[PDB]
Structure formats: structure tokens, C-alpha cells
Chain length 245, copies 4
Amino acid sequence: FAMKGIILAGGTGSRLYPITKVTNKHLLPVGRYPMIYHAVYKLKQCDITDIMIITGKEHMGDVVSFLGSGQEFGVSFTYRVQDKAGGIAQALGLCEDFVGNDRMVVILGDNIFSDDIRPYVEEFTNQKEGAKVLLQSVDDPERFGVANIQNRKIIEIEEKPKEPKSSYAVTGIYLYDSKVFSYIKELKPSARGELEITDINNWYLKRGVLTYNEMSGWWTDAGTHVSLQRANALARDINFGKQFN
Amino acid sequence: FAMKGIILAGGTGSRLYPITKVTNKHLLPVGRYPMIYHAVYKLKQCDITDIMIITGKEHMGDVVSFLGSGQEFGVSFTYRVQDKAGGIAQALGLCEDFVGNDRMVVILGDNIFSDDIRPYVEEFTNQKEGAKVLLQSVDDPERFGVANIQNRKIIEIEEKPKEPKSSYAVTGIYLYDSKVFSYIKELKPSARGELEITDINNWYLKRGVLTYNEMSGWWTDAGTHVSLQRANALARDINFGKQFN
Amino acid sequence: FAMKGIILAGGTGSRLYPITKVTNKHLLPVGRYPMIYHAVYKLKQCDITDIMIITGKEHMGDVVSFLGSGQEFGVSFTYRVQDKAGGIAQALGLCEDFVGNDRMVVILGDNIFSDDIRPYVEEFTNQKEGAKVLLQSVDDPERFGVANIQNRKIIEIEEKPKEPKSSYAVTGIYLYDSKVFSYIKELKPSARGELEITDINNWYLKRGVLTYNEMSGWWTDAGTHVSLQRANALARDINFGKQFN
Amino acid sequence: FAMKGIILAGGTGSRLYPITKVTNKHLLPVGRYPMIYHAVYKLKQCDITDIMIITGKEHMGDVVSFLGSGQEFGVSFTYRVQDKAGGIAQALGLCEDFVGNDRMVVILGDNIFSDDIRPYVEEFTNQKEGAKVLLQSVDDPERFGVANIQNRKIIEIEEKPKEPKSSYAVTGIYLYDSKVFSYIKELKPSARGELEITDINNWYLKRGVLTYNEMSGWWTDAGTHVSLQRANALARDINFGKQFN
Ligand SMILES: Cc1cn([C@H]2C[C@H](O)[C@@H](COP(=O)(O)OP(=O)(O)O[C@H]3O[C@H](CO)[C@@H](O)[C@H](O)[C@H]3O)O2)c(=O)[nH]c1=O
Ligand SMILES: Cc1cn([C@H]2C[C@H](O)[C@@H](COP(=O)(O)OP(=O)(O)O[C@H]3O[C@H](CO)[C@@H](O)[C@H](O)[C@H]3O)O2)c(=O)[nH]c1=O
Ligand SMILES: Cc1cn([C@H]2C[C@H](O)[C@@H](COP(=O)(O)OP(=O)(O)O[C@H]3O[C@H](CO)[C@@H](O)[C@H](O)[C@H]3O)O2)c(=O)[nH]c1=O
Ligand SMILES: Cc1cn([C@H]2C[C@H](O)[C@@H](COP(=O)(O)OP(=O)(O)O[C@H]3O[C@H](CO)[C@@H](O)[C@H](O)[C@H]3O)O2)c(=O)[nH]c1=O
């Protein structure tokens, strides 16, 4: 033994092309708000008001037009550009100076879910050091990072396994201490040309300082047509009040 | 006794705010395409390739970034700016010179439907003069222009009646001859400050040269959250081929 | 024996890179106005209010943000996209339907000059048919289309000659009848991959219906750093009044 | 007794309207580069590579399109939005967390000058604490912050005096320690509704830790038509090499 927020809103959006030809996936509707508003509200609800937003050079104009300084939402934004869609871990690496010695909650912009994050953030704040991942039991684990759980302990995490050990998806909501940046520096682009967040989670795991919690409500990614539509249906009654209009 | 296309894609998008804070309603997803692609494909399918697009000054950049010259879609686009959301009839008025002496099919950008328009365009091409409107029986006629039909004849059309005479909504797909422009010049902003398309339809009706057809498949507007979501669900399997990606 | 205006504002702007990385050359300052305002004012001063603007897909947003419907300037704009910088003649070809059977004044967006165009437009309006070009004696004719004048008659025009026959540059202000479009259809990309405006001027010349006038005041292109700076210096006291701000 | 860079590129640009209707003053040409490139190169030349850029919400898209992550220029950018043109001091206040305990060089985006800043940064790095301002003798001191110098000591600085005590303009290049932020918190909007940088400079002065240097080459603001044109002429031969294109 001071909590920062990070929303990763980069990527090409190729899977959703052409609805992402001009826009940027995280500015597409999810319910009555642009997708990215959900991540902002999740952090705000936990009193995490210092938030860094990462996106592509081309997309930054539109993202900033929506989010501004953050004053209208009761938060405070800082922006950085990710040159190429080189990976989640690469995007997170740009936030090193912003986080400093504090802890952070990282939310992948296309992850939409019902749980409040506060209970998890509070537990993590009571955790001496390390990281925490949030799990969701899913029907199609092959699409995600998958946690191999034995006797209530994570043995290993595997990214998009052809033969999943379980149905526990490691969601895109990560809680980290500042040590993550020193490890991000020991680079390895995977078979698909990316710095993998699963490698980071396994590093903390091997160090014996990774904890996890199973989420209670619904969760979905919004990066495919079917899952984007699902997120929209699930999000119908979500209301953020007059600050978010 | 030469058919032009017109897509009206203006308006404020206030009903959908904030998902329309930056974008423009007609560039929001409807299925796997931006809403406006549907109108373009409807016209293209009828071999109507000379198309004028009307939108706001602020929105034109994004609309043009999606649509371009029209070459990628096998069509040809021309653009004009509507300064203020002064009405459908006002927007149509900007297309006078573009249409010249030809006939036209006007599609409100937020009208999504399954019918091919060709059968209606072919009938209209065989109509000596006048106009044609396409009707849909709906559950909530109070939201639309409503046709009072007696003995298979339209007696009058009424815009958003408090007490609808019928459930026949006059959809936002209009077929007109070039005489519409001379009448648009005899202006009257309604109680809400707009030049009403219903007034134009009634002018043709009183002249005895308005025809109608009842549509066969589904139809929906996409200007409210619930109706936008409905259009998305209805549009899931719509495929425009590789030209539209 | 009805005069339309055309401003060609396309091209890559590569010569001015990087000041044209984001913007678009014709929106760069020339005096106290964006470059394109000069062309608009020239046409407006001649009571030519129906004006078509041609530019690239990417640049259209910014061009339209400046120009709008044209109402603020007392004119009326219509826009079309030129997919690639395939040439002046190609850009002009997109204006066929807009012009119809009328005559037109074409102004290359980067041509800045002091003369009023009215005297030339009035003469042309009294010309049975054909075209008219406006000439400027220059120090560096090798950069431009060059008119070979003998006994007060144009013998031929040559595009960027290595050995100029004269110092008479054929400026980027062209007056044409509607026959230009039928000829633009008989395509020939030059040695540099473009449809050449000089070929069009020579076609009218061989038909014996091309006239010319020598301009009286200053003129400059604004497509190079040095010439853009020159145009700025020359333009210091140009005032368009409160409509142009 | 670690040097950060700050470029303030906000403001309305009203003085330059309409050439700033769409763009943003700091993206207008100054020589063969956008105005803001000059400030970036000044900092880079001094090995100041961690740079924060402040601008308006609307302008951020274009600024980021030019600057990106900073990788192409050998620097590293972080961006924040200034909601309203509430003043230089207000804009600087947004950089508190970014600077932390380090020192900083602040450059007003519209200040163009020939001197290298290194000699001044090196002296400041050898200064126990405080601030440093750079002075230019000018013909029209009434337009600027003016230093009252007696016996080689600054007695006081006065913002845009009606009756200047001297012709020493306090330029828009400021060198500060991290204490500036604690003072920015003791707010006072001046007679024109702004937090004044001159008040900050006087605070350091009264504390006896403000130093100054007279600049050796040319300097100009670029916020008026005449001064923007002057900056352009002065900047003609400035070359930043292939990284800046
Ligand atoms: C590749 C990349 C992504 N991101 C952002 C954009 C998206 O909102 C978000 C998701 O990136 P994707 O490439 O779709 O990641 P995806 O394949 O869905 O898998 C990730 O997200 C899954 C949960 O959705 C996890 O289970 C996986 O362990 C994790 O690797 O992260 C960036 O900000 N920059 C990037 O370069
Ligand atoms: C007001 C206005 C609208 N339009 C475009 C934008 C929208 O895609 C489309 C619909 O405009 P709205 O104002 O929503 O019209 P709405 O109230 O839905 O009613 C219209 O559309 C209905 C069908 O959707 C018809 O039944 C009504 O007779 C007709 O008046 O027209 C413009 O291009 N410019 C405009 O100023
Ligand atoms: C190539 C091209 C150009 N244009 C527009 C953009 C510029 O404002 C303008 C000039 O194009 P440039 O390619 O620079 O043309 P340039 O080499 O200067 O020469 C032209 O302009 C000269 C006068 O400036 C004439 O003397 C030449 O006969 C004529 O060919 O036309 C387009 O709208 N589309 C295009 O594809
Ligand atoms: C008002 C304001 C300005 N700035 C940026 C935009 C401009 O590039 C730059 C200059 O702001 P201006 O309002 O023009 O400041 P100006 O009246 O020129 O005077 C300042 O700059 C002068 C030097 O140019 C100094 O001598 C004065 O002491 C100083 O107050 O600072 C912002 O980033 N945010 C702002 O709210």
C-alpha cells in the first residue's frame, strides 16, 4: 500500500465494417447512449474521475467531440493516440506516466455489463499488491481469454483457446497496480501481431498476486454485429441521468 | 408524358440525443449498414442512379465520407445543404434545378422497409401526371400522415391527427412529377414551424392526380429509440453485396 | 444563342505538404479570407449565383463547413465529389447535368486575381458560341498553359512547354458553352495521367470559336509556397464586406 | 533541485475570423508548416519530448490529425480540452497532473521566434527554484505584458498597459517550476474575464525567484492578420527536415 481510470477505445473496427467506416465502434449506439458512455459511467459511479482515453489518430476528433474535458459528466479526461491497432497491452502502455504510482481500472470500450464495479474496486484497494480480473461464464469461451480454475484457484489463462479448459471468460475489465508498466516493456507480439493482455494477467498470476471475482449480472462484448445488437437489447433501460442527456 | 432519386437526410436528430450528438441519425447503424445505405440501395435496385442527397451543413462531411461520388455503389451523387431543419418540403425544394423536368422518387432517410420500389415506380411511369404515395397500415397512426380512404379513394390526408380517421400511414416514400416545385413556392409554415409534405400530397389530391398503393411487407421509421431498435432487428439479414461491404 | 459558375477545388495539395496535410489548399488563407472565398466573390460580383463546387471526398466536410448553402453569401451552392485528382477536365466533367444547356464560368480555386470578370462575361454572352480564355503575360510561362499568339490570333495553346512560344499564360478562368461536355467524353490522359484543359481549349480553337482577352491587373496561382505567399501579399486590402465577415 | 513541454493552442481565433471559421489558428500556415509545428520543433530541439497540448473541444480533431502520438516527430504527446477560452493561466492549470513535480516550458502556440530555447532552459535548470521569462524589445508594447526594468531588475510586469513603462514585451515563452499550479488555484478573472499569466509572473517576482533574459533574434505573435503575415515572411527559410515533411 489514488485510483485512475483507463478506457481503451482504439482498434480498427474491421469486424463491424462498414458501420465503422467513418465513425469508430465506441461511438456507435448501445441503448440510448454511445457505447463509450457506459465505460465512463461505470468509472464515475466508483468515484474514479481521473480517466485516460486511448484511441486512434483519425477517431480522436469524434471521441473528443462527445467527451470533451469531462466536466459535463463530473469527470476529468486526458487523451493519447495509439498509432496502430497493435494491441490492448500496447494501448495500456501509453498510460504509464498518467498512472504514475497509483492503481488503475482498465475497461475495454466494447465491454458492456450490468454489475457496479465498486465492490471489486473496494476489494482490490484492500489487496496488498497485484491485479484482479473479473470472470463471466459464457456459452462460447473460444472467443475470449479463458481462466482454468481448479479448487477455486486460477491455474492459467489462455487467449482464445481452440479447446477451452472451462467456460470462464476473462472479461475486459482489469484492475492493476503500477507494476504492469514495467512488465509491458518486455514485449512479445503474438501469432496475430499483438501484445496480449492475457500475458500480463499470467505474469501477475505466476507471481501469486492475481485475484479474481465472478461477476453476478450480464456481460457482453460489442465487437461483432450479433453481440452489438445483443448489447443494444440488454441496454434498453439503462439511464445515466441528465448529465449524460 | 428520366427518373431522379432524392434522399432527405437532414433534421436535428434531437429525439435520439445524445447518440446523435456528433454523428447524424442517417449514419447510425440499421443492421450491418449505416441507415442511409438502405435508401441508396432501394433507388439503385430500381435503376435510379442520379441521386441528390440533402443534409445539414455540419453533417455533410460525414455523409460524404460514407457516400462519396457514388461510384463505389454504382450510382452518382450530388449534394446540397439545408441550412435549418425547416421541414421535409423545404428540403425537397432545394432539388428543383437537379430534377428539372424529370420525375422523382423521394425517400425520407429514416424510412426502412422491405418492399422493392420498382413495381411502384413502374406504375408511376405509366401515370400521365401527378404523384403517388405508399401506405402502411399501422398500430399507432397518430404519429404519421394519415390517409382517409373511402371506397378505395383517398379523401384527404391529415398530418399527425389527434383523432385518426384510419390506420393508413402515408409513408416517407413519395413519387412526384416536376410540378411539385412550383407548388412548394406557395409557402406555409405549420403550427410547429415547418413546410408540410402532407400539404403537397393534398394539393395533388385536390387536383385529382394523386394515386396510392398499399405496401406489402414491413415498414418502420427509425427516428425514435424504440423504432430505431426495431429497424435494427428487422434489418438483420439484409445484405447489399460487396459493393456496399 | 443563363450563366452558371463552377469552382474546381480538388487536387491533392502535395506541392504544399504539410500545410495541406489536414486542411485542403483552397481553405488556406489568402489575405483575410480562405482562398476559395475569392472565387465565390468573383462570381457573385458578376451576378452568377448558381455555383457548383468540386472537391475531394475527404475535403468536402471542411469546404462545406465554410461555404454552406451559399445563403450567407447571397449565392447558391451544389456540391460533387471528384474521387481522384484525375485532372481539371475530369473535375469539370462532373458538372454536365448541373450546367445543362447553359453557359459557364469555370474558376480554378487557386487562381487569385484583381480584375472583375464582368466585362469578359458580358463579351462572352454576346458571343454566338464557343469559349473564351483570359491571358496574363508572365515571367515564367513554362509553368502554365501558353498561348502562341500571331497577328492577334491564337494559333495554338501548349501545356507547360519546355520551350515556350510566348509569355502569354492561359489563366485558370474559363468561359464555356455547354458543348464542352460532349468533347470531355473523348478522353485522353496525358503523359502525367490527366485529362488536360488545354486540349479542350485547343478543340474550341480548331473549331474557330475560341476568343481571348488579355487581363489588365495582377494574377497569380497559389499552388506553390512562394506563389501562395505572393497571393497573400497581393490580397492584403481585399475586403468582401460583412456577408463574408 | 525532468523537463516537460506545454503548448497552449486554445482560444477562439476571433481576431482572425473568418480564416479561423473552421480550422483553428495554430493550424494555419506560418512559412511551409502549420503554426503549431514551430512550437513542437522548439521543444524537440531542447530534448523536451514529453509535451502536453491544450486546445478547444471542436479543434482537437484537426490538431490531433496533424500531430498524432508525436512518434513521427520524435516526441510524445498528451492532450487535454479547455472548455472555454477562459485564459492562458486557466489552460496551464489543466497540465498540473501531467507535470507533477517536474519543471516546464510553456509556449503560447502563436509565438514564433528565431532563438533556440536551449540556452534559457539550461540556465533555468541551474536555477534553484522559481520561474524565468524571456523579453523582446518591441515597437508596440501596449499590446503585450510589459516588464518595468530598473537597474537590470524587473520591478513589475503590467498586462497591456495604456501607458507602458518600457518597450520590453514579456513574450509567450515561460519557464516554471511545479509551484505555479498551487498559485493558479487562487483565481481572479481580470476586467476581460480571464486568469492572467502576468499575475503568475508577478507572484514569482514578489517571491524574489523570477529571472529574465532578453532574446537575441526576432520574435512575433501571429494572432492578428498583419502579425500572421509578418510571421509568414519571417519564417520562409525555416526547415524542420524530413520528420516534419
Ligand atoms: C486491438 C486493440 C484493442 N483495443 C480496444 C478496442 C476494443 O474496444 C477492445 C477489444 O479489443 P479486441 O481486439 O476486440 O479484443 P478481443 O479479441 O475482443 O479480446 C479481448 O477482450 C476479451 C473480452 O472482450 C477478453 O476475453 C480477451 O482476453 C481480450 O484479449 O480493446 C485498443 O484500444 N487498441 C488495440 O490495438
Ligand atoms: C424536418 C426535416 C426532416 N428531413 C428528413 C430527416 C428525416 O430522415 C426525415 C423525417 O423527418 P421528421 O421530421 O422525422 O418527419 P416525421 O415527423 O417522422 O413525419 C414525416 O414522416 C412520416 C413517415 O416517417 C410521414 O408519415 C409524415 O407524413 C411525415 O411528415 O426527413 C429533412 O431532410 N429536413 C428537415 O428539415
Ligand atoms: C488536377 C486537379 C486540379 N483541380 C483544381 C485544384 C487546383 O485549384 C486547380 C489547379 O490544378 P493544377 O493541377 O495545379 O493545374 P496547374 O498545373 O496549376 O495548371 C493549370 O492551371 C494553370 C493556371 O494556374 C493553367 O495555365 C494551366 O493551363 C492549367 O493546366 O484545379 C481539381 O479540381 N481537380 C484535379 O484533379
Ligand atoms: C485566451 C487563451 C489563449 N490561449 C492560447 C491561444 C494563443 O495561441 C495564445 C495567446 O492568447 P492571447 O489571448 O492572444 O494572449 P495575448 O493577448 O496575445 O497576450 C499574451 O501573449 C503575449 C505574447 O504574445 C504576452 O505578452 C501577454 O503577457 C500574454 O497575456 O494562448 C489558450 O490556450 N487558451 C486561452 O483561453
